[PDB]
Design a protein around this ligand. Structure first.
Ligand SMILES: Cc1n[nH]c(N)c1-c1cccs1
Ligand SMILES: Cc1n[nH]c(N)c1-c1cccs1
Ligand SMILES: [Cl-]
Ligand SMILES: [Cl-]
Lengths: 282, 282
């Protein structure tokens, strides 16, 4: 194969990062082209509507023999590459990155979007520096919250309504809580260098470990981590979704009540913004 | 307002049955026009694809200032009108009508469609005769079963997967069972002349009655009804959807093992078909 004439007209394609590096011809600036073999409809619609510094932006789109999505290039790569092979980040770097992951997911939920696939491989770092801006990516499994079939059903008389439907009312509207569980698994991995649930050196099934919410706690590893960080992990890795910490609750947790970390994020933010800055009305 | 020029071109509109009576100009045959104020997308797609004698057929469609759906005219009206005001059908008529309702819902499920709104007001009778063909209508709340987000999710490793998601695996794929509950409430109403769950002369909430599956049993009323009929009602009005009778299970129940009723249905079927009948290759 070859790239479509339309893409080629605007971009000079390069090395694989399938995601490839490309140069926008107009600006000579680098971009990332995500190629999907011929759901991408919702993904583009979600991404076009979202506007947050910790959420990846669509720059352009091509629907040809394959789907081509032009995105912001993140030079630091994946968070996965910083946590793989029992490698662990400094507690302060976990805080900085986590704080941004919380802001991004709070924005998503505020905007009626559930990501559904949060992992270290879907978290991108802006630079090769420890202190940097992170961005959430991969909205292919994301879900849009609107008016439910349940809300419509509850309007009528339930003379003919099945009991399982009435039982589901208790839990309805807690889907977003799956993202908070994911964040707790990401935070555990970042702080410890190891996954909370695994089939490595265990008799109990990965399924049974998760439903019981009995994560693997290794004291020697966690002794290096503060009580505050672990308290937040414990609060997100709660089995009952109605009881689990929300992004707002996590954001108010003592561990995130750090003015230093918050200043470093604002600093990185304005450093990135300095290029875009239009003159101000005094 | 007025009717669109496109509808008027083909049909001479009449009296209200909003659903109106109309005459197709080409054939002079009567039709029913369902008017919806400007979901009807799925409804038309579902109805165009379905082909069963106990399911209503779309004859035509108009998307104007309002949605106009041209349907088969059912001269006997709604089943509701035969059961309202404590009126009760003969046990044999219940069997005939129920047998057709089961065939229709079996077809729907076989074809990956869940109706979601089965009631006496959505069951239409073909003629003003007790022994007639019934048809299922109102596919506006209907749902299409395809490949789930759950099936896709189960393919990956659940390292980051929330426990409620793994718990939902146990019940997944039992949505169709809501239609069987509805059928049990319809069968109860038809045989008794009264609803199984109501706020009339009760202290217990309609919600609590349904989730407990504790229907109102009045012995004086049900003494007139056979043990076999009541056994089938009891089997459909089961709270656990995994244990509840399916349409196939209902169809194999002793109450429906009636060759007389089955011959009367085949008789009504061929009487309706006699008009359409193209010569046969001997
Ligand atoms: C999008 C995007 N922007 N910058 C990078 N490295 C990506 C990648 C996503 C997935 C693999 S690489
Ligand atoms: C459709 C249809 N065909 N024949 C009748 N009576 C209808 C009605 C549906 C709802 C009210 S009337
Ligand atoms: Cl090429
Ligand atoms: Cl008119």
């Amino acid at each position: 194969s070859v790239y479509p004439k339309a893409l080629r007209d605007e971009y000079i394609m390069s090395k694989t990062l399938e995601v490839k590096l490309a140069f926008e011809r107009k600006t000579c600036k680098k971009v990332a082209i995500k190629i999907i073999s011929k759901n991408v409809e919702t993904e583009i619609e979600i991404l076009k509507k979202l506007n947050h510094p910790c959420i990846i932006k669509i720059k352009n789109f091509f629907d040809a023999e394959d789907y081509y999505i032009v995105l912001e290039l993140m030079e630091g790569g994946e968070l996965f590459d910083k946590v793989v092979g029992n490698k662990r980040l400094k507690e302060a770097t976990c805080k900085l990155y986590f704080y941004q992951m919380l802001l991004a997911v709070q924005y998503l939920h505020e905007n009626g979007i559930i990501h559904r696939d949060l992992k270290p491989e879907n978290v991108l770092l802006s630079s090769q520096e420890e202190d940097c801006l992170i961005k959430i990516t991969d909205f292919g499994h994301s879900k849009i919250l609107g008016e439910t079939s349940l809300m419509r059903t509850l309007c009528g008389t339930p003379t003919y309504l099945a009991p399982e439907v009435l039982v589901s009312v208790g839990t309805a509207g807690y889907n977003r809580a799956v993202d908070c569980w994911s964040l707790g698994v990401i935070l555990f991995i970042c702080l410890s260098g190891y996954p909370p649930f695994s089939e490595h050196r265990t008799q109990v099934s990965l399924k049974d470990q998760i439903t019981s919410g009995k994560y693997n706690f290794i004291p020697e590893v966690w002794a290096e981590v503060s009580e505050k960080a672990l308290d937040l992990v414990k609060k997100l890795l709660v089995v009952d979704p109605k009881a689990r910490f929300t992004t707002e609750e996590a954001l108010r947790h003592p561990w995130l009540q750090d003015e230093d970390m918050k200043r470093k994020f604002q600093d990185l933010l304005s450093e990135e913004n300095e290029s875009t800055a239009l003159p101000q009305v005094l």
